[PDB]
Design a protein around this ligand. Structure first.
Ligand SMILES: CC(C)Oc1ccccc1NC(=O)N1CCC[C@H](C(N)=O)C1
Ligand SMILES: [Zn+2]
Length: 140
């Protein structure tokens, strides 16, 4: 589990969104596994606006932050899970790293800020849903 709190927005994995998230919905996209809801309190996270391909992510199944090299956001095939059938997920970046069911939501960050959140994994891989192209998170 995990979320990004930027301004008056909460960014979470769409497959882990709560009823309160759906009842205060700002934007959602199943193809990216992202959902954004509105919040009453202001958040402290800042979004990265860069082209970094190295950063650090939080892995809840190890209570550790790991440095990783990750691919550019692209369309990747993801195996069937209890949340989605086997399909192509867009704006996904892959890296070599530990991930397990429960690790979704952990933040990936670079020197410029938050890059994205854990969304996929398996066999020594971890995939992150990019959020750097969502410019509207920085305003309104
Ligand atoms: C990060 C962890 C949950 O990943 C795994 C780690 C080890 C084995 C499987 C997964 N599961 C996985 O890749 N998911 C399940 C949840 C929905 C994801 C999606 N965005 O389509 C796909
Ligand atoms: Zn950066």
């Amino acid at each position: 589990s995990g979320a990004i709190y930027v301004g008056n927005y909460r960014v979470v994995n769409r497959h882990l969104a709560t009823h309160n998230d759906w009842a205060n919905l700002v934007w959602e996209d199943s193809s990216r596994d992202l959902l954004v809801s509105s919040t009453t309190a202001q958040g402290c996270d800042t979004i990265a606006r860069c082209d970094c391909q190295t950063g650090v992510y939080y892995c809840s199944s190890r209570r550790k932050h790991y440095p990783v090299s990750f691919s550019k956001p692209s369309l990747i095939f993801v195996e069937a899970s209890e949340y989605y059938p086997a399909r192509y997920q867009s704006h996904l970046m892959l890296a070599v790293g530990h991930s397990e069911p429960g690790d979704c939501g952990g933040i990936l960050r670079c020197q410029h800020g938050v890059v994205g959140i854990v969304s996929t994994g398996g066999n020594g891989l971890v995939g992150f849903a990019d959020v750097r192209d969502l410019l509207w998170l920085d305003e309104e």
